Write a protein that binds this ligand. Structure first.
Ligand code: PLP
Ligand code: PLP
Lengths: 363, 362
């Protein structure tokens, strides 16, 4: 009886490797946990992590790749602090398609005048039509979240923001597919969701965007400072950068971002087919054109969800050792998380369970 | 195997980490994959906090939070949370080395910073506290307990006329008991003495929350983080786990009191050799202020003898003793003597020093 976890996870071979190397990394006589950030040994590690980010995503040479502490929510502060002063107005445009872009917009209010570019959504079930976005020509930047982790809304295109600096929260689908980096001013992602373990955040920053940081910006969070120090302004989250490195290498060894995209396709289409042929039994609230490949929320019984049937679904799932499928407090129902490390075989099992559960309970 | 005079983990901690990596206590999941919102992790961050409270005897009116951004994070996080306490937005700073100097410089981004004493010509002492020019309208007074690069350590708590006292304890945190009730904020990067890089522990008096500036990033705002048990966003889960073990090891080895006993033995072994080398090994810090954590010294003369110093480090290395090179901005030699660095380890360093003094002194 081993557990199946529909949440973020490390590939198994990556844990084996961490574990083997833990007391005496590669023969250096020391643990990465113990390694000075000023050592040529750590320099090599951090260098290889930057390199892998650039290779895997195909990051053009006019972008800085930096590794920061603070996580996603750190960047909700760091983005405005670094960038709201791009133009003197200190205005920014925000696109709000879920809980995460909502928090980000709320946070940015501390630093400037935030314009939410579309009518506020009643339910987070779609991306408001980008061609109706009410953009500020004097916005310092336009901000949006690529993948809304709790609501299952994912951008599968790069919106036209009329030449503005585009900033993107990519935390929960980072390196789940190729990305045309050159469309962006800033991309960021906490490593934990998809690309490693908590403690580090990758920030990709166009090289012409440094140098507008507010006075109040903490130095550890200032893109200019961090990029001029190759992420060693202070002590970075060493082990996390190490762990990320090994995950990125794993992505490379698995065929790269393109392979990841193929594996998300398969995984989600498996689950979405079941929903879309359940003739009402499973109800995903997201308009199909905006459905996440990473997080699939749904209800059981009907669109408002049937509490009894959902409890039984979770209870039985727990009984089969399928963990972490409970939908978020704010949405209710079920959520299936399908990151790079969640295998096709895991997902085949969830699917088989859903089909059986349908057979038994659909009146 | 080697011997490192730098921050390390106790060997036994690393053994447990490795033992449990793939499957934390039979739960079927790594601490590295653990959801920060799970009951499994809740146990952990709860255990870690309680060990701090226990090991330093933190009073009840203090919050203990775990944050990202490092000691340097706190260089901003302190003023951002507190410079606004009094409306002038001033802080007094005591600058006794590299780190308090950075801290004082960073704090300029958020208020008017006054350095309480004249600037030292060289970091070789704590300028006497009665000579300090304290501002009664300052929001708080800031100092660095242990200067890692210059070997200058407070062995007392400064009288700041009742001001809110703020103290960077990164490099000597839990090497001794601390009267926490005397402070407004204590903070510490975990990596120097207490664990691994990626978490910073902040001890904050609960009446000092919500004076934070509007510009304070929520994840660094004491109030936000304390009101959420450091679970406002995803915490550095692994770093917290690791630190928890380290504190557990301190506890099992006799707590803050025993570390102080160790720190005394370890450092007096080196300072003994230094002071009786009749000028062969010279330590630049005044005796009354010398660090128990970091021991910087020159060989040959007070200014350092390059040939003797190279040879020292050369031979040290051949005896597998690593990381003894003094910091690039100071030259010479530095022995770091954190908790994890044993009496047996220092014992070998000392033997070497005596014999090097023997083979080379004229
Ligand atoms: C997890 C999440 C965040 C927040 O990340 P933290 O490290 O907890 O601050 C931001 N955006 C998305 C899409 C997320 O899934
Ligand atoms: C190492 C050190 C720091 C640096 O902290 P970071 O985590 O690297 O930002 C701060 N204060 C003291 C006393 C230190 O020794």
């Amino acid at each position: 009886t081993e557990n199946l976890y529909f949440q973020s996870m490390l590939p198994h071979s990556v844990l084996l490797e961490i574990q083997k190397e833990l007391l005496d990394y590669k023969g250096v006589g020391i643990s990465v946990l113990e390694m000075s950030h000023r050592s040529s040994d750590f320099a090599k590690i951090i260098n290889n992590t930057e390199n892998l980010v650039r290779e895997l995503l195909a990051v053009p040479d006019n972008y800085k790749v930096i590794f920061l502490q603070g996580g996603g929510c750190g960047q909700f502060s760091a983005v405005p602090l670094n960038l709201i002063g791009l133009k003197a107005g200190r205005c920014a445009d925000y696109v709000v398609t879920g809980a995460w872009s909502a928090k980000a917009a709320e946070e940015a209010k501390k630093f400037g005048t935030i314009n939410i570019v579309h009518p506020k959504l009643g339910s987070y079930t779609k991306i408001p039509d980008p061609s109706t976005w009410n953009l500020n020509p004097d916005a310092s930047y336009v901000y949006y979240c690529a993948n809304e982790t709790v609501h299952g809304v994912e951008f599968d295109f790069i919106p036209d923001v009329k030449g503005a600096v585009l900033v993107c929260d990519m935390s929960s689908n980072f390196l789940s597919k190729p990305v045309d980096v050159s469309k962006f001013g800033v991309i960021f992602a906490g490593a934990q969701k998809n690309v490693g373990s908590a403690g580090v955040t990758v920030v990709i920053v166009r090289d012409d965007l440094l140098g507008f940081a507010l006075r109040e910006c903490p130095s550890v969070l200032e893109y200019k400072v961090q990029a001029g120090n190759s992420s060693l302004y202070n002590t970075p989250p060493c082990f996390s950068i190490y762990v990320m490195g090994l995950v990125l290498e794993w992505i490379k060894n698995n065929g790269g971002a393109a392979a990841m995209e193929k594996l998300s396709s398969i995984k989600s289409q498996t689950i979405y087919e079941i929903i879309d042929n359940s003739q009402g039994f499973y109800v995903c609230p997201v308009e199909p054109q905006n459905r996440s490949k990473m997080n699939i929320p749904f209800r059981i019984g009907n669109a408002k969800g049937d509490d009894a049937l959902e409890k039984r679904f979770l209870d039985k799932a727990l009984e089969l050792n399928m963990l972490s499928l409970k939908g978020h407090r704010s949405v209710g129902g079920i959520r299936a998380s399908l990151y790079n490390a969640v295998t096709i075989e895991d997902v085949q099992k969830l699917a088989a369970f859903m089909k059986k559960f349908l057979e038994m309970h659909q009146l």
